[PDB]
Design an enzyme around this catalytic site. Structure first.
Site, mmCIF file in Angstrom:
data_model
loop_
_atom_site.group_PDB
_atom_site.id
_atom_site.type_symbol
_atom_site.label_atom_id
_atom_site.label_comp_id
_atom_site.label_asym_id
_atom_site.label_seq_id
_atom_site.Cartn_x
_atom_site.Cartn_y
_atom_site.Cartn_z
ATOM 1 C CG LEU A 1 -6.172 4.829 6.704
ATOM 2 C CD1 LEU A 1 -5.670 6.221 7.001
ATOM 3 C CD2 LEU A 1 -7.275 4.920 5.639
ATOM 4 C CG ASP A 2 -0.275 -0.978 5.625
ATOM 5 O OD1 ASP A 2 -0.746 -1.464 4.536
ATOM 6 O OD2 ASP A 2 0.775 -1.393 6.147
ATOM 7 C CB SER A 3 -5.943 -2.831 4.485
ATOM 8 O OG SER A 3 -5.566 -2.717 3.141
ATOM 9 C CB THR B 1 -0.974 0.073 1.248
ATOM 10 O OG1 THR B 1 -0.161 0.081 2.411
ATOM 11 C CG2 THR B 1 -1.893 -1.145 1.281
#
Length: 368
Positions: free
Chosen positions: A253-255, A75
Site C-alpha cells: 500500500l503506497d498512496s 510512506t
C-alpha cells in the site's frame, strides 16, 4: 476528533497533461485513437520514479520559533529530513533551511547519516528539536541535510524542502522510531496509528489523520490485514484481474504511487483482447470509458476481498476525445509477484496504517 492535516497532491494525470501540452500531443493521441477505433491498428519501458505522486504539505514546523517547511510524505521512510542552513549543494539554495542556532529547543545529536541511492545521495546529521504538525508536537530526532546530490530535475523544480516519513525504515541505527510512534511514546496520541483519506472527488487532495480512527471518513467495517513484512506497508493477497490471476502476491500500500501496478506479464494477459489501446511512443493505455469488457479487479485475503471497478481504475480524458479514458494501471516489474496499490485504490478505500499492531486496515471511503 484526531489531528488531521490536508496535503496537496501532484499526480500522474497532472504530469501527463503537462507533457501533452509541452509537446502539443492532443491531436496526435486523438488521431491515434480514431485510428484504433476504425480499427486499423495492431498489426517498452516506464520507471517506478515516474509513478510517484507528490504528497506535500506546508504546515509542519521545526523548533520553538516554528521554522516553516514544505514536506512531501514518504510512506517507506521512518525519518524526517530537512535542508540544513549549512547545506553545501546548489539544490539547497532556493529552499527553506533549518538553523539550529535559531531554536532554543534544539539538542545537538550530530550523529552523521548517509543515504546513497540510484536517484541520488544525501548526507547529513541527526539533530533533535520540536517537530510539530500542528495540533501535535514532540521533541524528535530528524536528519539535517548538509549535502544533496541527485533527485535532480524534481527537487529544484519542486517547492518541497524535505521528506516526512510515514513508513518503517530508519536510516540510523539509533532505533529512532517513526514520528508517529514517537508521538505515542510521549503520549501525545493514544495509538501509533494513522489513516489516509483520499477524497474521490478531488484528486489533488488527501488527508492524514494521526493517532485515532476518524469514523467520519468511511462507511461499513474496517478490515485489517497483517503486514507480511517487518518494515513495509505490504500484505499477502491473491490478485485477480478477469481470468488473469496471481496467488499469494505481495501487495504494497503506497498512496504516494499514482496508479495501480501489476507485473508486465500479468498486465499483458490482462490487456489482450480487452480492447485497450497503447498509443505509439507514449506510455499511455487508453480505452473507451464504457468499455463493457473491463473487469472488476480483486485483491483477495482469507477474509475479505478488495475490489476496484473500471470506474475506479480509469481516468477520463475527455479534454482530448469524447468518452476516452486512460488505464490507471501500469505494467512494472519490482520484486517477483509484487503489486502496488496507489492513489486509485485509496480513492475507494480509506486506509489505516497501524504501527502498534503491524496491520493495515481498509474501509469503504465516504464521498466527502
Amino acid at each position: 476528533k484526531y489531528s488531521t492535516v490536508g496535503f496537496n497532491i501532484e499526480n500522474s494525470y497532472d504530469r501527463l497533461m503537462k507533457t501533452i501540452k509541452e509537446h502539443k500531443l492532443k491531436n496526435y493521441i486523438k488521431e491515434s485513437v480514431k485510428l484504433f477505433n476504425k480499427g486499423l491498428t495492431k498489426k517498452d519501458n516506464v520507471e517506478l520514479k515516474d509513478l510517484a505522486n507528490v504528497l506535500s504539505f506546508g504546515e509542519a514546523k521545526l523548533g520553538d520559533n516554528g521554522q516553516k517547511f514544505n514536506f512531501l510524505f514518504h510512506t517507506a521512510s521512518s525519518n524526517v529530513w530537512v535542508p540544513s542552513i549549512k547545506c553545501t549543494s546548489e539544490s539547497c539554495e532556493s529552499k527553506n533551511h533549518y538553523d539550529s542556532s535559531k531554536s532554543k529547543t534544539y539538542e545537538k545529536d550530530d550523529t552523521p547519516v548517509k543515504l546513497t541511492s540510484k536517484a541520488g545521495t544525501i548526507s547529513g546529521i541527526f539533530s533533535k528539536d520540536l517537530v510539530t504538525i500542528g495540533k501535535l508536537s514532540v521533541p524528535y530526532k530528524f536528519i539535517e541535510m548538509t549535502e544533496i546530490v541527485g533527485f535532480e530535475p524534481f527537487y529544484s523544480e519542486s517547492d518541497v524542502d524535505g521528506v516526512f516519513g510515514l513508513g518503517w525504515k530508519d536510516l540510523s541505527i539509533g532505533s529512532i522510531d517513526p514520528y508517529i510512534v514517537e508521538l505515542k511514546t510521549q503520549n501525545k496520541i493514544e495509538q501509533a496509528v494513522y489513516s489516509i483519506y483520499l477524497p474521490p472527488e478531488n484528486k489533488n487532495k488527501g488527508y492524514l489523520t494521526i493517532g485515532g480512527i476518524e469514523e467520519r471518513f468511511f462507511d461499513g467495517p474496517l478490515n485489517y490485514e497483517k503486514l507480511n513484512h517487518d518494515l513495509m506497508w505490504q500484505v499477502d493477497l491473491d490478485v485477480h484481474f478477469g481470468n488473469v490471476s496471481s496467488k499469494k502476491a505481495n501487495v504494497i500500500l503506497d498512496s504516494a504511487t499514482s496508479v495501480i501496478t501489476v507485473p508486465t506479464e500479468f498486465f499483458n494477459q490482462f490487456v489482450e483482447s480487452a480492447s485497450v489501446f497503447k498509443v505509439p511512443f507514449l506510455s499511455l493505455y487508453v480505452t473507451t470509458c464504457g468499455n463493457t469488457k473491463l473487469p472488476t479487479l480483486e485483491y483477495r485475503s482469507p477474509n475479505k476481498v478488495y475490489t476496484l471497478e473500471p470506474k475506479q481504475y480509469l481516468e477520463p480524458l475527455e479534454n482530448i476525445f469524447s468518452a476516452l479514458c486512460m488505464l490507471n494501471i501500469v505494467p512494472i516489474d519490482l520484486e517477483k509477484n509484487t503489486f502496488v496499490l496507489g492513489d486509485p485504490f485509496m480513492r475507494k478505500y480509506f486506509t489505516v496504517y497501524d504501527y502498534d499492531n503491524h496491520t493495515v486496515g481498509f474501509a469503504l471511503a465516504k464521498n466527502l
